[PDB]
Amino acid sequence: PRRAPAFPLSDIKAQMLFANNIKAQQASKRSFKEGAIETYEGLLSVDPRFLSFKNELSRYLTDHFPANVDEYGRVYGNGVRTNFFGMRHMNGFPMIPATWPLASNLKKRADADLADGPVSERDNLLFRAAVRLMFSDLEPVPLKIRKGSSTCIPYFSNDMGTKIEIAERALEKAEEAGNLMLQGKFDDAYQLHQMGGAYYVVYRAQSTDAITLDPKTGKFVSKDRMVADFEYAVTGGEQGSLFAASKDASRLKEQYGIDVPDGFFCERRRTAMGGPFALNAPIMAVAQPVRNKIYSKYAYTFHHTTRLNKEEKVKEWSLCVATDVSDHDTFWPGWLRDLICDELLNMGYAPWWVKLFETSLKLPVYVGAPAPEQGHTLLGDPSNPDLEVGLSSGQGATDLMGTLLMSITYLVMQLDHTAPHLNSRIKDMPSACRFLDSYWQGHEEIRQISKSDDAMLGWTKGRALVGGHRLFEMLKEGKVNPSPYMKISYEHGGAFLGDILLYDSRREPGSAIFVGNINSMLNNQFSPEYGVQSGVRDRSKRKRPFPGLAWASMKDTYGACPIYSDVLEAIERCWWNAFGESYRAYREDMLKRDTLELSRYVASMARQAGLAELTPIDLEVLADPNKLQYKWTEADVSANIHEVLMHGVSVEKTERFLRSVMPR
Ligand SMILES: Nc1nc2c(ncn2[C@@H]2O[C@H](COP(=O)(O)OP(=O)(O)OP(=O)(O)O)[C@@H](O)[C@H]2O)c(=O)[nH]1
Ligand SMILES: [Mg+2]
Known part of the structure; x- marks a missing residue:
């Protein structure tokens, strides 16, 4: 039921992804590498x-x-x-092999009994209201770029000056490129403005993963991590196999002369994708203003800083349900990309911009090296982007895509199982918008705090509270999935954005505290x-x-x-x-x-100022800036510290770009 086309590196379609420079050529050819x-x-x-x-x-x-x-x-x-x-x-030593990324998640979703579109008109209005609230009255800001980050396809540049030039040029030429894509001229948009091509697959370590000690044998057992072979990935699971990767580290003694103590394993490896920077720049220029809006107007649901900031909200709740989502990014639905795009068009967003955004979520993927003597293959045809990978990690608005899906998914779950009395408040688009605006500000008896796939759902005193307890019981029983959209369960050991919710003897949110893990x-x-x-x-x-x-x-x-x-x-x-x-x-x-x-x-x-003016966030971020990509945002970091890690394109260039995208 439709295999994705695959091209070896030798093919012109794959060769076109890599510019005539050493860095890009080395990236194309990079063989499987490992080491301490x-x-x-x-x-x-x-x-x-x-x-x-x-x-x-x-x-x-x-x-x-x-x-x-x-x-x-x-x-x-x-x-x-x-x-x-x-x-x-x-x-530094990965499990072998790493997964081949699924070219289509349609069968994956269908087999998990997940919906291929909004189930009801209410849900359709809510997903659309999320777009209207998130993308409406945005203010232009400078386009910030992480220092040392790659431009990926096609140049693979890590130089800030080059990156600034590419980004400025991309904002200047986004309209022309988007219009070419609207005409089906993807190769032209890519050849002229480097907007298109593919995501570049890098495999990143998940340094810690579950290990248990078997009391019967006294031997350690590592959690099996399922991986798809090439055949499985291209066929969306129709053909090929899904099997446990090898975490056994015994091989390191023979291969490298490294002593392997008992119960030490190879690391879990996750797919991570780097987007073509020229395509990402115009998306980022809209995504940042959206984050600024949701973290300010809807700070209750979306803006999370300290353990006390989280605690203040949760303490007011009569019930707190800590949810878990199975494999969010791979299950993320393409129908949501299409619904978002359709709604942005209805709002009056430039069609050329919406096309660039749509294309960023259908793009082919270049697989590097999942294992020795494997990879160097392009999945999907860049001449006609049509992949259904779910959510690509390097897309310019991935955090917002996960947040939009999940926030509505959890609200729907609260409506379906606990609050049918609120359904009357969602009759059309204006009423859906008014309700969601109120819900996101924490003004309803049903509440939530979320970021992508991490959330805590709340109920205050009222009619929905009893339903809230039944939902929590249904989650504990774990026999029925409470959502038609994603695979939801309760988190075993409830935590939110790294902070564990520590309950006392009462087991109530009012007496519970957020503590560091x-x-x-x-x-x-x-x-x-x-x-x-x-x-x-x-x-x-x-x-x-x-x-x-x-x-x-x-x-x-x-x-x-x-x-x-x-x-x-x-x-x-x-x-x-x-x-x-x-x-x-x-x-x-x-x-x-x-x-x-x-x-x-x-x-x-x-020359020796000390850490006097720096916050704990500033220190954690300077030690690990990856925390700025999943835990915190720009506004949480001191201005002088943000400048250490990021550089920006002038607000003058982005202001002009944003005026051309946004409705009148
Ligand atoms: N501290 C830290 N956290 C990370 C890092 N990389 C990923 N994470 C978190 O890992 C989480 C992944 O959840 P998943 O493992 O995919 O959930 P799953 O696919 O159902 O598999 P399970 O772990 O069994 O639940 C995300 O919410 C990430 O933010 C990292 O480098 N450092
Ligand atoms: Mg959680």
């Missing part, structure tokens, strides 16, 4: 002392701090939700996704610019965890056993070095 990450300066993830430390610490913490999660997935007591074995991976501290400190990149001179371009700074924000971030002190003491004791050194002193030295190095990057910071 430089966890910290002069320390490898596979260092025998480091692995010995991880073995002792993971075993000790699991033993002394067993999970405290009730029958309803509510965290209590110690604030622990699982064992601590997730740290037991040979960081101590397991995330361990993930970040001992299992970073990337190495220190000590060879990259410009620290602002590194994936981990100032790792030492995280020590200064630790107490602020994790201090509220019941076992915070216990974990720090266990780390100190285990690090002494493994290295014969103080971990605290080691981190204090790294903090000093990185504080000194930071002043070189901040114009306002005198």
Whole structure:
């Protein structure tokens, strides 16, 4: 039922994706690569002392701090939700093979009994009202670009000057390119303005993944991660196979001469896609103003900063339901892309812009290297973008796409199962807009706090409260999916955007508190996704610019965890056993070095200014800017710190661009 066309790298269609420069040519050909990450300066993830430390610490913490999660997935007591074995991976060595990305998710959705469009007219009005509220009265802002980020297809440039030129040119030529696509001239739009082509598939590490200790055998078992072979990916699952990837690390001894201690595994690998920058720039120019609107006008539902900021909202609720979505990005529906596009056209958005946006969500994918002697294949034809991959991670508005889908999905779930008395308030578009505007501001008896696939659903006192409890019970029973749109369940150990909701004996939101997840501290400190990149001179371009700074924000971030002190003491004791050194002193030295190095990057910071004016968010972000892509936003970071990590195209160029996109 329609296989996607596939082209080898040798084919002209794949060759056209890579410009005549060394960087682009190397990206096309990049073979499967693996190796130990430089966890910290002069320390490898596979260092025998480091692995010995991880073995002792993971075993000790699991033993002394067993999970405290009730029958309803509510965290209590110690604030622990699982064992601590997730740290037991040979960081930098992936599971083999990684998945081939699914070219079509239509069969995947149908087989999971998920809808191929809005079920009812009410749902249709709500998805459309979400578009009207999110995209209406936007204000132009500079187009911000992450320093050291790639332009991907076709140039693969990491230079800021080149990136600024590409972005400015893209805003100037977006109209001409969009109009060519409207005429079906995709190859022309790509050849002239580099708008089209494909997403470039990079495989990123998920450094920690589930591991259990079998009491019967005393042997560790890693969570099986299902992967699709080429045949399965091109046929959308009609043909080929879905099988467990190999996380067995035994191979490292034979291949590399690395000693593999018992119960250490290869890392889970996730597909990540880099968009063609010329196509992304005009999308980003609209996406940022949308985020600014939703994080201001609809801050209740969408703007999440601190554990206390989240706590203030949740404490007012009579019931809090922490939801879980199965494989959000791969299940994301193409019918929603089409509904959004149709609604933007109805609002009066430039048709050429809507076409660029639509095309960004149908684009072919270039598969690099999922395993040795595999990959280097383009899936889909760039001459006619028609893929149904779900949500591409490198699309200019992925966060908004997931947020739009999920916010409405959860509201529908609350309406269907708890609040039929509110259905009368949604009769047409104006009434749907008025209702959603009120709901998103937290003004209804049914409420929510969400970001993409993470959410907490709330009920205050009223008619919907009883229904709220039945819905929670249906989730606990786990026999019926409460949504027609996505696979929803309850989170086992309810958390929101990294903060665990810690309940007491009462098991009520009013007496529950948000605390930092101590397991995330361990993930970040001992299992970073990337190495220190000590060879990259410009620290602002590194994936981990100032790792030492995280020590200064630790107490602020994790201090509220019941076992915070216990974990720090266990780390100190285990690090002494493994290295014969103080971990605290080691981190204090790294903090000093990185504080000194930071002043070189901040114009306002005198040669030895100190961390005085910096917030805990600023420190966490400087140590890990990936937190700025999933946890926080630009407005949460001090202006002088945002400038370290980002650079922008003038608001004058974006202001002119935005005027041409937006309705009259
Ligand atoms: N701290 C941190 N979090 C990450 C990182 N990468 C991804 N995440 C989070 O990982 C989550 C992924 O949820 P999934 O694993 O796909 O859910 P699933 O497909 O149903 O599989 P399960 O893990 O069994 O639930 C997302 O919500 C991400 O934000 C990272 O590098 N660091
Ligand atoms: Mg959650």
